[PDB]
Amino acid sequence: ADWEAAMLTLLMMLKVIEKADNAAQVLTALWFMALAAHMAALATPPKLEDKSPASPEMIDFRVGFEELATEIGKAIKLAALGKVKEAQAAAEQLKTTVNAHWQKYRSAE
Amino acid sequence: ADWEAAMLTLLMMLKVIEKADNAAQVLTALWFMALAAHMAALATPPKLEDKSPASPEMIDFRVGFEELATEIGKAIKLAALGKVKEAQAAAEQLKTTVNAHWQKYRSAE
Amino acid sequence: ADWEAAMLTLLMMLKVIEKADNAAQVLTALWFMALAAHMAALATPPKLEDKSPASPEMIDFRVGFEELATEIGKAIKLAALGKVKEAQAAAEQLKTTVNAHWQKYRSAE
Ligand SMILES: [Mn+2]
Numbered sequence: 001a002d003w004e005a006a007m008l009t010l011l012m013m014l015k016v017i018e019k020a021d022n023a024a025q026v027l028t029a030l031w032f033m034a035l036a037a038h039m040a041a042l043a044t045p046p047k048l049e050d051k052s053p054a055s056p057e058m059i060d061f062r063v064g065f066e067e068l069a070t071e072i073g074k075a076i077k078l079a080a081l082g083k084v085k086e087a088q089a090a091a092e093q094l095k096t097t098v099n100a101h102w103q104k105y106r107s108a109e
Numbered sequence: 110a111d112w113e114a115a116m117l118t119l120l121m122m123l124k125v126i127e128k129a130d131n132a133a134q135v136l137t138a139l140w141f142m143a144l145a146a147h148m149a150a151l152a153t154p155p156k157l158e159d160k161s162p163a164s165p166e167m168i169d170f171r172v173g174f175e176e177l178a179t180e181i182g183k184a185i186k187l188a189a190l191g192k193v194k195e196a197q198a199a200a201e202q203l204k205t206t207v208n209a210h211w212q213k214y215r216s217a218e
Numbered sequence: 219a220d221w222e223a224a225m226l227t228l229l230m231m232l233k234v235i236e237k238a239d240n241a242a243q244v245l246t247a248l249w250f251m252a253l254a255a256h257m258a259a260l261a262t263p264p265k266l267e268d269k270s271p272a273s274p275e276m277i278d279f280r281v282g283f284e285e286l287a288t289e290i291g292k293a294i295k296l297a298a299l300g301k302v303k304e305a306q307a308a309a310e311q312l313k314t315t316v317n318a319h320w321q322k323y324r325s326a327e
Contacts, residue, residue, distance in 0.1 A: 023230065024230065024234060027227065027230065028250065031227065031250060031253060031254065031257075034219060034257055035253060035257075038257060072219075073219040073220060073223065076219045076223050076227070077219065077220065077222070077223035077226070080223045080224075080226035080227050080230065081226065
């Protein structure tokens with residue numbers, strides 16, 4: 001999967017977490033968010049198509065994706081510990097990380 | 110997971126996509142198809158057990174698996190865009206790619 | 219995801235397999251167990267924080283995680299073949315592998 005398909009996966013799974021009821025649904029959705037990021041970890045946004053891999057603008061995209069996967073992992077642990085509301089609260093703070101990362105590298109759509 | 114277990118996962122998830130109702134179920138099943146392929150990306154079919162990795166018959170299996178993951182990624186994006194029928198139509202064309210790849214490297218079962 | 223979050227994912231998915239009804243639910247949960255292990259394949263338990271990577275105590279943790287992913291893959295194939303009870307029986311023997319691996323490297327909690 002390319003970049004902007006995994007970003008829409010993240011956004012949609014965040015909507016599943018809000019409408020969740022138990023720890024299984026949120027943990028499942030969170031793992032899908034972790035899954036999507038790893039399959040698209042090596043993907044490239046449409047903006048940074050012709051940018052060099054060693055460019056400061058591209059590596060700043062790589063650390064932001066690594067940061068995104070780091071907040072996902074922390075929310076996964078809270079859901080794995082049976083704390084549904086402590087994780088859903090972390091998924092809300094995660095949403096502002098997915099959103100900021102998305103429009104910064106979106107194709108202006 | 111070995112090769113023919115992930116191929117049965119693909120086949121079963123295609124059946125889930127036909128019986129889906131919303132974008133969440135098809136996107137989830139599609140990501141499972143992408144998941145299965147990556148975990149079995151380095152797997153080897155029972156036929157090509159003793160074939161050399163640089164053999165033309167083996168590399169042709171590798172590019173076909175890469176092609177399979179490429180059609181999955183495209184169907185994932187259509188489901189991520191909320192187009193359930195545009196993606197289910199792509200999952201049907203994907204089914205003929207999973208089927209052709211399966212029996213070509215199946216253990217004649 | 220770190221180590222003890224993926225181990226709780228494994229434990230919770232085993233509980234989903236017991237409460238499953240069809241091949242889709244068990245195969246899905248099993249793939250989540252395979253997923254969790256690959257994302258945490260390079261993770262480090264809290265005990266082995268300061269141990270060297272070439273230490274016998276650390277490599278013994280690596281082969282045990284590889285063994286864990288091997289039993290998961292075999293249970294995935296049984297669920298992929300439509301054998302729900304043959305796989306749920308394998309998931310029960312898998313549970314004693316997840317449990318033994320968990321408390322051996324748990325942070326004494
Ligand atoms: Mn990987």
